[PDB]
Design a protein around this ligand. Sequence first.
Ligand SMILES: CCCCCCCCO[C@@H]1O[C@H](CO)[C@@H](O)[C@H](O)[C@H]1O
Ligand SMILES: CCCCCCCCO[C@@H]1O[C@H](CO)[C@@H](O)[C@H](O)[C@H]1O
Ligand SMILES: CCCCCCCCO[C@@H]1O[C@H](CO)[C@@H](O)[C@H](O)[C@H]1O
Ligand SMILES: CCCCCCCCO[C@@H]1O[C@H](CO)[C@@H](O)[C@H](O)[C@H]1O
Ligand SMILES: CCCCCCCCO[C@@H]1O[C@H](CO)[C@@H](O)[C@H](O)[C@H]1O
Ligand SMILES: CCCCCCCCO[C@@H]1O[C@H](CO)[C@@H](O)[C@H](O)[C@H]1O
Ligand SMILES: CCCCCCCCO[C@@H]1O[C@H](CO)[C@@H](O)[C@H](O)[C@H]1O
Ligand SMILES: CCCCCCCCO[C@@H]1O[C@H](CO)[C@@H](O)[C@H](O)[C@H]1O
Ligand SMILES: CC(C)C[C@H](N)C(=O)O
Ligand SMILES: CC(C)C[C@H](N)C(=O)O
Ligand code: NA
Ligand code: NA
Lengths: 498, 498
Amino acid sequence: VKREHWATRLGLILAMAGNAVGLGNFLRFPVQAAENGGGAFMIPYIIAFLLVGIPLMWIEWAMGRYGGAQGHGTTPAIFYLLWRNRFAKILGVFGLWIPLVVAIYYVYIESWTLGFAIKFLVGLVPEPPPNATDPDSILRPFKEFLYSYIGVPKGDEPILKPSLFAYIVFLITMFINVSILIRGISKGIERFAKIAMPTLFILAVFLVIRVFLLETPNGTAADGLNFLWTPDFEKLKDPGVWIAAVGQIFFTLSLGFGAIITYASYVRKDQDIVLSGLTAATLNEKASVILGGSISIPAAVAFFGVANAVAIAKAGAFNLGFITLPAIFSQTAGGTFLGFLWFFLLFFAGLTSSIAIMQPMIAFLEDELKLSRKHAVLWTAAIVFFSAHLVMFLNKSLDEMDFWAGTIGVVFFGLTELIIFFWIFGADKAWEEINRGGIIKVPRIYYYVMRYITPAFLAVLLVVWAREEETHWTVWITRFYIIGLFLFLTFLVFLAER
Amino acid sequence: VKREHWATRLGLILAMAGNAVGLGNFLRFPVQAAENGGGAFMIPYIIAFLLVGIPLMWIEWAMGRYGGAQGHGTTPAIFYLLWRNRFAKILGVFGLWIPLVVAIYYVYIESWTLGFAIKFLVGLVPEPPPNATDPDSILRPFKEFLYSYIGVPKGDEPILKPSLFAYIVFLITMFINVSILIRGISKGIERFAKIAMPTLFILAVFLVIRVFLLETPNGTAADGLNFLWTPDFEKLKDPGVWIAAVGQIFFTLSLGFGAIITYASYVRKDQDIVLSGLTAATLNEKASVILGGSISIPAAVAFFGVANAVAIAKAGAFNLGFITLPAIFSQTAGGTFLGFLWFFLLFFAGLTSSIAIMQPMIAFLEDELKLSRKHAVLWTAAIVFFSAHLVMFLNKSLDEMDFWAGTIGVVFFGLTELIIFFWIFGADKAWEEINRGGIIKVPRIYYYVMRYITPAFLAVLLVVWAREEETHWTVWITRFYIIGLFLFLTFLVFLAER
Ligand SMILES: CCCCCCCCO[C@@H]1O[C@H](CO)[C@@H](O)[C@H](O)[C@H]1O
Ligand SMILES: CCCCCCCCO[C@@H]1O[C@H](CO)[C@@H](O)[C@H](O)[C@H]1O
Ligand SMILES: CCCCCCCCO[C@@H]1O[C@H](CO)[C@@H](O)[C@H](O)[C@H]1O
Ligand SMILES: CCCCCCCCO[C@@H]1O[C@H](CO)[C@@H](O)[C@H](O)[C@H]1O
Ligand SMILES: CCCCCCCCO[C@@H]1O[C@H](CO)[C@@H](O)[C@H](O)[C@H]1O
Ligand SMILES: CCCCCCCCO[C@@H]1O[C@H](CO)[C@@H](O)[C@H](O)[C@H]1O
Ligand SMILES: CCCCCCCCO[C@@H]1O[C@H](CO)[C@@H](O)[C@H](O)[C@H]1O
Ligand SMILES: CCCCCCCCO[C@@H]1O[C@H](CO)[C@@H](O)[C@H](O)[C@H]1O
Ligand SMILES: CC(C)C[C@H](N)C(=O)O
Ligand SMILES: CC(C)C[C@H](N)C(=O)O
Ligand code: NA
Ligand code: NA
């Protein structure tokens, strides 16, 4: 049984870390953190990591490597292997659907960063003057820059209008993903991680350091880190703090996307996954809390003050990353260069991720329909590139996909993979597989944390918010399409049966 | 099993006639005829039939039976068999796409007729009073009845809102198609034709006769037939008269839909197709010109006068069939029963057609992906039922599909199948195959009419109107989806290659 396998431990680890350490860590985490009060977030975030992130990851690595040894890297096949049943194959489809759909808006956002980076380099960006009473006059220019890039509706009709440059950069971005994926796990995804992850780190640290030195009449970067890392044991009982948290742990760690599983399916039948997994997870938590957390917020707080901060977070993940930060940098020395690094950092962080959520579909086509990698890769590119047109042109199409696939879906799927592995398959058999070949071993306690805690924890979540009715008629367009994708992925699964 | 084959000659013929004699003959033909002046139409219609309808049909029967003997009933495989090439398989995809797409709005319209029939029977329809100065007060009620049925936008947003009864009747209608198709060619499509076609005929004649006796202060049915069958050799040079005509010949005869081909693929390798084809075609021309032509128009002319007629035709195929006619009948004795027969007639006529344009997809799944009929039938039902939601809810989605697949596509495909058969494959080899097993033989002359005339004729058409770009932003939604269907059918074709 061929199937590719990680060339080297480090190569593996870094690919996996690149799987997780994406636009989420940098655009999304900062916003979640400052939205809920800041110090109210960092704690539930860490716990959820210990109580959900870790347990769930070891599980995915385990299911991935387990299936890998039998020729299967995706969840319709894997779910069925562990749990012989028809309903297994059907639920397994979400491990193709979620990545596919997320990939469909992700690579587009990823392409923005590239486009800004190019324009910053060449200095085709706005360079507003110094204003000490018209902050509006510094944001406005940057605000108009993004809106013109993506074609934000100026009237009403929920219709976007990408620039030719935005569209063309999307093509380039897709091409780059293909050029990487079309080389496979080691000679492609792995080769790229070894180059990209270090690069990403240095850019990240540099910006972290450089942002730390930020200081204006309105505050200091220091004040932002304080706001993030100074606890508030009050709220911490209001559990919207544990919804944002547990939920963020999924996206940030790429859990419930079928992706960790697919990558793990390349790991040799007897290679360690206990230490490797733990290492990668940790790199991710570092990249988020230290790196991601210490750039945009501390910078915004430095320029706007700590109160005008929670409001900026509430403004959304795109305002901060694509409007506010660039506006801030434009007021600091050599700030045009600071924007470039930022967007190049985001780009490489996006790229190491997008290739991860495109692999499940590619792996399925090779494993189950027996396509050549070239074909498996190009058809997946076609489906993603084609489908992304809905995201580029239809207002709030992105929000809708992000919600169903990227927010709800991952959690339900997280809970589902756990139940199939640690309950249906056999908690004991699962615990052994997870520990087999372990350079280190899983602290026993965890066995009880995945067989009862983790699943309970998730059940409570899915129950709480689920406790609690219209919306633009256009959401139904996006909902129609992605439901269509499911019907279609299900059909393909049905065809792989003979 | 080498595939199903028509049980009996008559069974075959009638299935084929049922293939062609659909809602087109009754809702569409009458409107095309009266739109252009009436007498200006009947002549170019007949010629086009002799010069395009006939030649093209014999070709499709021939390609169908040719592929059938080799296990293939659809055009991606057949096109490739006659013309060894990759581009052959790709163009062949339109023989799956056109039927699929047309089926996607057709079965919905078909379902309307059923729904009205039920409501007429039970008398849940409007029964306006007698008005001799407020014709508006007789149409209005009927107008509101259809609009409420399909949920015609009362404000602006291009959004439909089917009634629960409309929606449920669509389910029933889909179920009826499935119950038929899921039994196969002979024990299903054939069994049904033998029952449906005679039934359809008697209803049709009865209405023809009963409409003939129509007479009001404003005109007589007689005047309508006169208007249709009294020539106007002037216009007859304005060739929008040959665009409506040649174009109508396609829909009316089900040419360029891949459907005639699929059915023919069941005909035994050595069964006659020269006489059988000629017979069926003719039944269709009868059903159209005598039957279809003598009901709605003569009735409208009887009640509204011959001048207020061309205007009603211009109002569209749905006004006449679903609003105007029912309004007219409501003013004649036992008219509530006349509406029932009409809609039951349309229903049976729609049903014998919808099963025809669903078979190409079903045949492909069996022939190329080796699915069981049950599965091939249910998956095709799923794709059609799912996709029709776009048609039920999005205003002008139907128009768009009808245009690209049902109007443009058929013609281009007509011309394409001809070129591949009578040019690439070999005009001589084609002529022999078409004549092999012929109970009668093709009048030689035709050889030159398909090898030069027919193709030229079509080229001129495609060129003329093509001689001469905004519109609601919603057309792009439908255009996006159906392009998606193509990408998807192409992918399936790619998979059947191993
Ligand atoms: C992939 C990592 C980044 C994901 C970003 C997805 C954030 C989608 O967030 C959306 O942004 C919109 C515009 O501000 C708002 O209108 C919506 O309320 C909000 O849900
Ligand atoms: C493969 C699916 C193709 C769908 C049609 C894509 C049409 C792309 O259209 C492009 O969009 C850009 C952004 O609005 C515009 O700048 C350009 O005018 C236009 O060429
Ligand atoms: C909602 C589904 C995504 C499809 C949207 C495609 C946007 C079409 O955009 C169109 O492209 C044409 C040709 O490229 C140009 O002629 C027009 O300028 C432009 O309106
Ligand atoms: C809820 C998960 C808590 C994670 C912290 C576990 C830290 C490891 O904890 C250690 O594990 C060893 C092996 O099980 C034991 O010998 C020790 O009792 C324990 O200190
Ligand atoms: C026999 C199959 C019935 C379907 C044919 C009727 C569908 C045509 O639909 C019509 O299209 C016209 C052109 O866009 C519009 O002017 C009309 O509003 C619309 O009713
Ligand atoms: C595969 C289909 C995806 C879209 C879900 C279709 C749900 C439509 O469903 C129905 O539509 C009817 C007509 O408007 C209404 O009468 C009913 O309220 C509703 O149940
Ligand atoms: C192309 C769009 C096809 C999708 C069909 C959307 C039908 C809307 O669906 C309906 O919406 C109502 C109000 O939101 C709800 O009360 C019902 O649950 C639901 O049936
Ligand atoms: C526009 C094309 C109309 C063709 C009508 C064909 C009428 C039959 O035409 C006949 O065909 C026979 C066989 O070739 C010949 O033997 C006869 O001489 C000829 O009259
Ligand atoms: C969808 C995931 C691959 C995203 C990635 N884990 C991130 O944090 O951005
Ligand atoms: C699509 C075709 C089956 C339509 C049919 N020939 C009709 O005239 O109604
Ligand atoms: Na990444
Ligand atoms: Na019919």
